[PDB]
Amino acid sequence: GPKFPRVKNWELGSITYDTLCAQSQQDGPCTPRRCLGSLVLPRKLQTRPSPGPPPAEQLLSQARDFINQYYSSIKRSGSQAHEERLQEVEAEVASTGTYHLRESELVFGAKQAWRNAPRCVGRIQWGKLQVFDARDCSSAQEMFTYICNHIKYATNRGNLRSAITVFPQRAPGRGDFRIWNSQLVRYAGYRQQDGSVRGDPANVEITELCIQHGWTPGNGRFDVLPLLLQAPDEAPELFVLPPELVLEVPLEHPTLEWFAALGLRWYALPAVSNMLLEIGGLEFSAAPFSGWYMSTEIGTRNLCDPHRYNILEDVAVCMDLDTRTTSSLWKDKAAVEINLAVLHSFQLAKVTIVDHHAATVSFMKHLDNEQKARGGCPADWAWIVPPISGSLTPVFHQEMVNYILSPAFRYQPDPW
Amino acid sequence: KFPRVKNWELGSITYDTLCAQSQQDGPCTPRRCLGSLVLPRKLQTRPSPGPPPAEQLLSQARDFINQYYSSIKRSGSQAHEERLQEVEAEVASTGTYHLRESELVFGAKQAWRNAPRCVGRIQWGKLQVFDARDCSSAQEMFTYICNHIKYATNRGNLRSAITVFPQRAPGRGDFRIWNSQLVRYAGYRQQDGSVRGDPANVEITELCIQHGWTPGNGRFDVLPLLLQAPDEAPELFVLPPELVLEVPLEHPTLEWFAALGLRWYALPAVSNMLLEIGGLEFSAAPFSGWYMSTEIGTRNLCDPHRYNILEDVAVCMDLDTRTTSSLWKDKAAVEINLAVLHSFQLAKVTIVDHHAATVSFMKHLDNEQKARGGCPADWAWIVPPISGSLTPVFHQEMVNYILSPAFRYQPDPW
Numbered sequence: 163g164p165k166f167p168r169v170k171n172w173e174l175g176s177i178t179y180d181t182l183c184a185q186s187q188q189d190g191p192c193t194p195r196r197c198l199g200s201l202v203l204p205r206k207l208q209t210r211p212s213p214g215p216p217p218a219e220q221l222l223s224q225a226r227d228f229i230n231q232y233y234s235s236i237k238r239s240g241s242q243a244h245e246e247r248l249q250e251v252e253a254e255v256a257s258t259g260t261y262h263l264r265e266s267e268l269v270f271g272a273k274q275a276w277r278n279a280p281r282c283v284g285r286i287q288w289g290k291l292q293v294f295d296a297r298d299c300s301s302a303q304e305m306f307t308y309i310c311n312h313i314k315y316a317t318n319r320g321n322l323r324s325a326i327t328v329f330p331q332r333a334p335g336r337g338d339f340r341i342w343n344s345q346l347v348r349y350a351g352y353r354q355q356d357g358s359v360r361g362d363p364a365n366v367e368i369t370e371l372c373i374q375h376g377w378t379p380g381n382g383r384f385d386v387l388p389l390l391l392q393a394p395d396e397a398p399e400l401f402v403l404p405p406e407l408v409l410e411v412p413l414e415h416p417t418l419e420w421f422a423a424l425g426l427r428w429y430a431l432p433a434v435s436n437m438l439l440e441i442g443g444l445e446f447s448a449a450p451f452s453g454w455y456m457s458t459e460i461g462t463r464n465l466c467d468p469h470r471y472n473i474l475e476d477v478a479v480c481m482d483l484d485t486r487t488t489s490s491l492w493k494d495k496a497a498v499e500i501n502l503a504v505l506h507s508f509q510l511a512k513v514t515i516v517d518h519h520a521a522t523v524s525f526m527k528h529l530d531n532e533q534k535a536r537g538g539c540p541a542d543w544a545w546i547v548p549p550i551s552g553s554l555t556p557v558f559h560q561e562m563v564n565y566i567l568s569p570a571f572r573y574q575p576d577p578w
Numbered sequence: 579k580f581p582r583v584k585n586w587e588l589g590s591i592t593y594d595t596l597c598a599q600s601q602q603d604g605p606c607t608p609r610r611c612l613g614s615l616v617l618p619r620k621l622q623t624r625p626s627p628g629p630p631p632a633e634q635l636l637s638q639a640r641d642f643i644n645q646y647y648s649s650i651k652r653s654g655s656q657a658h659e660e661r662l663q664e665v666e667a668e669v670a671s672t673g674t675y676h677l678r679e680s681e682l683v684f685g686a687k688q689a690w691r692n693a694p695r696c697v698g699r700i701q702w703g704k705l706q707v708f709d710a711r712d713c714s715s716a717q718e719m720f721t722y723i724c725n726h727i728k729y730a731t732n733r734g735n736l737r738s739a740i741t742v743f744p745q746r747a748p749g750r751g752d753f754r755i756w757n758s759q760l761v762r763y764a765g766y767r768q769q770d771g772s773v774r775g776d777p778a779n780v781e782i783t784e785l786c787i788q789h790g791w792t793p794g795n796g797r798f799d800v801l802p803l804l805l806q807a808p809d810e811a812p813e814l815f816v817l818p819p820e821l822v823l824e825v826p827l828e829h830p831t832l833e834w835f836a837a838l839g840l841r842w843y844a845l846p847a848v849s850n851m852l853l854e855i856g857g858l859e860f861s862a863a864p865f866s867g868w869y870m871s872t873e874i875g876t877r878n879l880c881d882p883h884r885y886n887i888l889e890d891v892a893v894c895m896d897l898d899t900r901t902t903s904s905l906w907k908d909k910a911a912v913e914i915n916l917a918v919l920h921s922f923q924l925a926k927v928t929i930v931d932h933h934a935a936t937v938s939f940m941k942h943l944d945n946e947q948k949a950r951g952g953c954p955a956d957w958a959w960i961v962p963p964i965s966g967s968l969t970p971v972f973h974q975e976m977v978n979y980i981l982s983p984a985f986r987y988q989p990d991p992w
């Protein structure tokens with residue numbers, strides 16, 4: 163048969179071939195020898211700080227490829243406007259060492275990056291993304307205004323809208339624009355004397371960083387952290403988000419009346435802010451993006467991970483389950499009710515949310531659309547299948563091919 | 579080159595140096611990862627009508643023998659050298675060789691140990707190895723299989739076992755067990771195109787009737803075995819009801835569950851895989867242990883392409899099947915897995931839940947890190963089909979690679 167990866171769906175018995183991977187110009191962790199596909203941060207993509215300007219020729223080949231992708235998307239490949247834009251990018255790189263993107267090219271690339279993200283199960287929405295251009299931003303203070311506008315627009319009082327704000331690209335001989343926090347909204351994690359943590363253990367370091375920069379800490383489990391925004395060559399400045407902008411949802415359960423008394427809650431807007439947006443060789447170190455939550459992100463990972471809120475045991479005790487033995491499946495029962503509480507509470511509060519069943523079904527539709535449109539879809543199986551009820555969703559039975567396509571969202575080293 | 583493996587629940591880190599011993603390649607490449615694929619494109623094991631290359635075989639043989647003598651700490655000794663000369667002498671004159679029972683036992687255990695997809699490898703050292711290499715007929719195969727089943731079942735106190743039939747030989751048909759498992763429920767494709775019984779077994783069920791078996795009309799009809807001796811049509815052998823222990827499914831609190839008439843067998847015995855030791859291939863080597871509850875409760879009973887009983891249970895539980903957000907599927911699934919565990923514990927039949935199993939697997943990884951400097955594992959298979967992140971293995975990065983001895987997939991005989 164064909165010379166491309168054969169991908170099978172074991173539920174429906176259907177077969178497809180991924181021809182899109184052929185266009186992957188970057189390598190990943192795997193080798194014929196061993197499969198390092200489960201590693202969360204394998205050292206390949208890793209956009210480690212490469213100070214001194216990049217090879218003029220390497221940037222070029224990357225820029226040429228992107229422009230071609232752009233002209234193809236508009237069905238004008240090989241046209242006069244295409245060849246001229248190519249001549250322009252080269253001329254620019256030849257005299258300055260870098261180049262700049264036109265407005266429409268940025269919008270296109272931002273959407274492609276999302277479209278290309280192997281770990282995102284919400285890609286059926288890729289074509290619907292509000293792209294805020296913020297490449298004129300010249301201060302940490304201005305960064306704060308743009309971000310507040312982003313949160314306001316994206317939150318949209320509960321009827322969430324996907325969006326991304328793009329700050330100035332990395333420049334030769336100039337510091338990067340950086341948002342120190344991993345997400346625009348994060349709960350503080352306070353390191354106690356007795357070794358434990360109050361709040362979210364995941365945010366311990368950033369919480370301690372805000373303190374070293376002048377933040378006066380609180381002492382709750384759900385304290386919203388301030389932002390540490392960094393303009394070029396300047397130390398990060400602290401900014402506190404107006405409570406009214408940060409929409410939160412108190413969690414309650416549809417039938418277990420005591421669940422509300424737990425005082426649990428979570429914020430409505432999931433906005434990643436520490437990832438790097440790469441387009442045609444240009445690197446956007448600060449380009450926060452946000453969509454809406456898939457219920458399991460909150461109910462299973464954030465609230466039940468042993469290294470996060472770890473509320474499984476407490477909730478099980480309230481449901482009066484036998485937590486002394488594994489065969490009682492007490493962990494499973496509690497997790498289900500907690501995830502149900504998240505869904506119930508968001509719907510009640512009229513805030514956008516999607517359960518793992520709906521999400522995965524929609525992702526299958528996305529795979530089908532992309533099979534026709536591009537001959538494949540890069541996907542990270544371990545990240546696409548939900549943390550609970552895995553084989554109960556359609557994606558579990560779908561084989562997937564993972565590879566890196568550019569434009570893309572990449573991990574980058576912490577500024578500190 | 580040495581994978582830096584990390585555990586995200588504890589923050590601990592280790593380096594896998596064992597993968598360097600891997601001489602066999604996987605499907606992955608630096609350009610794209612295909613680890614989520616179940617069966618290879620061709621990594622299989624092409625035909626064996628001719629003798630395998632002497633240099634190739636001799637190399638795998640010497641390596642395996644080196645392995646065995648390290649295991650008994652007699653490496654470099656005289657016996658070790660005389661065994662190497664024996665193997666080299668035999669291969670040079672016949673193009674192949676044979677293993678000693680002790681070596682075979684060692685090889686069978688290492689194969690289990692090296693199985694990337696097995697979560698119960700903590701039990702790898704406890705395996706009853708039955709040497710069935712002195713088998714010359716389908717009928718003999720059957721008797722051997724019946725003894726394996728009797729031994730392994732052990733009145734409900736399951737014991738891990740493997741029976742090894744004659745190795746493959748150049749230019750001669752293979753000994754084969756056509757069934758994928760020793761115990762499988764029939765899949766009768768009823769007119770409508772739908773299926774009564776286990777849909778996964780529609781093909782083998784067809785082949786059995788085609789070879790004379792008189793089918794039934796139930797959802798849990800135990801199939802007969804199609805045993806095949808070299809270059810001979812497979813024969814039909816019905817398994818004695820007494821040998822095939824089964825567990826009636828009922829729920830600890832929901833009284834109507836038993837009414838569903840659900841049931842499942844006690845012994846999970848894979849019989850379609852190939853066992854490779856030092857270059858020798860054993861096309862018929864059925865092995866078995868005991869079930870992990872999710873294999874039955876989640877996959878076999880709830881997979882959409884299997885018994886797919888999720889909705890039925892939900893309707894009986896009186897849940898909101900109208901929408902996905904009511905999490906009716908997750909709810910019914912948990913009760914079904916609870917029923918399986920309850921039932922098996924009630925019938926005094928060995929079983930392990932996914933929580934206990936993964937904790938043990940974590941320990942195994944630990945034991946292996948100190949013993950061999952690593953442990954090949956396939957994350958997608960190790961992590962349970964439900965409550966993934968609720969178990970320790972989900973948060974553990976894993977490295978996947980091929981070590982030999984090894985259990986491999988092989989073409990269907992027909």
Ligand code: HEM
Nearest residue numbers: 276279281282283284287324325451452453454455456571
């Ligand atoms: C519209 C709603 C969306 C949903 C429901 C969704 C859902 C998901 C989920 C479940 C994850 C996994 C989170 C984790 O386990 O860490 C994820 C990862 C990701 N998503 Fe989406 N997504 C959506 C929108 C977005 C948007 C708007 C972008 C970008 C423009 C995006 C980019 C990504 C990327 C790059 C990752 C990988 C992050 C990482 O590697 O940690 N997603 N998404």
Ligand code: HEM
Nearest residue numbers: 690693695696697698701738739865866867868869870985
């Ligand atoms: C002691 C009890 C054992 C338990 C609890 C256990 C559990 C498991 C589980 C849950 C799987 C996944 C099966 C699937 O999803 O289809 C598996 C796969 C596997 N196990 Fe074990 N196992 C045990 C004993 C054995 C034994 C005795 C052997 C061999 C001597 C073995 C060899 C393997 C192999 C080769 C696979 C992969 C099979 C395939 O690719 O389909 N296991 N085991």
Ligand SMILES: C[C@@H](O)[C@@H](O)[C@H]1CNc2nc(N)[nH]c(=O)c2N1
Nearest residue numbers: 200201202544545972973974975
């Ligand atoms: C070990 C590593 O593959 C595991 O921790 C991954 C697996 N799935 C997964 N999936 C999502 N969506 N998010 C995650 O953080 C992870 N973690």
Ligand SMILES: C[C@@H](O)[C@@H](O)[C@H]1CNc2nc(N)[nH]c(=O)c2N1
Nearest residue numbers: 558559560561614615616958959
């Ligand atoms: C698509 C394919 O990788 C998926 O169906 C795999 C994943 N995990 C898994 N895990 C186990 N234990 N058994 C299986 O059959 C599978 N199937």
Ligand SMILES: [Zn+2]
Nearest residue numbers: 192197199611
């Ligand atoms: Zn891989």
